[model samples]
Target: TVGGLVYFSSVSEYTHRFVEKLGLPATRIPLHGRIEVDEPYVLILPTYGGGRATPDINHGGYVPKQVIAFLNNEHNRSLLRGVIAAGNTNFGAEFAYAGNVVSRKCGVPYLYRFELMGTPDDVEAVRAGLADFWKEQTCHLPSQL
Candidate 1:
């Protein structure tokens, strides 16, 4: 399990190290440059139940279409362990919508619904697995931001 700061420096350094260790191509692209035509877009919309909305509550978000391409690619798909989402409320509902989109378009069950209360060990296990998988393929670590 890996436990460290989830900032730019750490992420970049990890990606570089992972790539070097795996002897794989390092394709560093900005989010804009990663766009693709056949990618599936996942839109996350938030709804209120007439209650207080927490400060960290996200009403909605969007996943780029390029994710579909990545999911379909064997190398890329092997790097993923399903997307985990968390929020103040409507976690299940939001995940359902996003997961449906990913499953339907990517033709793979690629969504993992999670809460914020899990044990640190469990979280670390998941994170480590993903990190290892990603390194094995793209030889890069994912940035938390």
Candidate 2:
């Protein structure tokens, strides 16, 4: 089965627009609330911290606060299969850093990354990529008795 999409979009809603273009099943982590997911899914998150002259451990709040809250939910955290991060290229090494952080913390794949709002090409790649990703997931599942 195809995994679902879950994301945290800023008030500016750049990630929201990107997900809409994907035109696949998705759920948004609200700005000021909570949510939990029951099925496997990939997280689409935006890099929030600002650029710094010297990248340090506290370079920025790459992962939005709301996303942290959402993932903190044991139930939601369990179902996360991967992460897709959005960021500005100007940030140098920090570009799309959220994906790296989340994937490391959660032990999931950093499936992909794109700039803000995403180009049409980015949307298409993610759409097709997810299809392949889900199929691969099925293959890796333990065989039924």
Candidate 3:
């Protein structure tokens, strides 16, 4: 989580906890840098957070060029298995913008699209779905869930 800019310079509490819960090492994808994913893994990122020009977060409508370039490569694209992030679901429909972006690209195939952190029930829902997705099963998560 040292991508220079503040947003990418540190790990968010929720992401750190999620990785810890799964007993997996956390690896941050540099905002506009390189990443090499050789196997399936969880991708944690945030949406545009909706501001300035628009009220709705553009689902996948705005990903960094470098990251996008990485995923454009076949190897990196396939290694993507799932996503988790927060969105502006309050404005009628900016749900899980980040998660949907990746899925829409390579078919990921879960949530708290509501937010990175939430109440116990919400956290449980996120972790439950994430735990299932965490498994190495060929299809614990779907390409289009």
Candidate 4:
């Protein structure tokens, strides 16, 4: 669990360290996990769902767990464990979707969800129907440059 082992009720040497550790500076380290100095590291990915929704047999639709696994080291789907979530409320059944589905199928926890702004990569891909080929090629990309 990404949970803590302590409580926060008073202030002492231990309390100071606790808060200090919790409040450590953080920044996106780039091409990888965010650098959270003196604290646990952070990683931000495109939102993955409402996995934990729907017909009861479906996994995340946006990005499957295996695809997430493939994006990391071989067979290492574990990297996407705790995903961040948010999106449109007008999405109907898909409202507040993907993160939870990803978390469940990926054996992770979705931080939470709230309605908000988002991105466009998927839009173009879907419109062009090239989202599939896109990954197939990107997967074989030889350079990170």
Best by TM-score: 2
Q: How high is each candidate's TM-score?
A: 0.32, 0.92, 0.61, 0.37
Writing each residue's lDDT as its tens digit, candidate 3 over 93-124 gives 45556566666666776334545544456556
Alpha carbon lDDT at 118, candidate 3: 43
lDDT of 4 by residue, 1-145 (tens): 1221111111223222322343322232233232222322112233334444343425435543433443354323333324444445656566545555556665655544434432343323222332232234447668867
- Ranking of all candidate structures by their TM-score, best first: 2, 3, 4, 1
What's the true lDDT of residue 53 in model 2?
A: 53
Residue-wise C-alpha lDDT for candidate 1, range 75-141, written one tens digit per residue: 5444433343222335444432434444444454442333333344535654565565445544555
The alpha-carbon lDDT assigned to residue 72 of candidate 1 equals 54
Write model 2 residue lDDT over 1-145, tens digit each, in one string: 5469998888788999999999897998887988778898999999978677556544548889999899889999999999999999999878888888898888999989999999999999999899988988767878789
What pairs collide in candidate 3?
A: none
Q: How many angstroms is residue 32 displaced in model 4 relative to the true structure, after the best TM-score fit?
A: 14
Could you tell me which 10 consecutive residues in candidate 4 have the lowest summed lDDT?
3-12
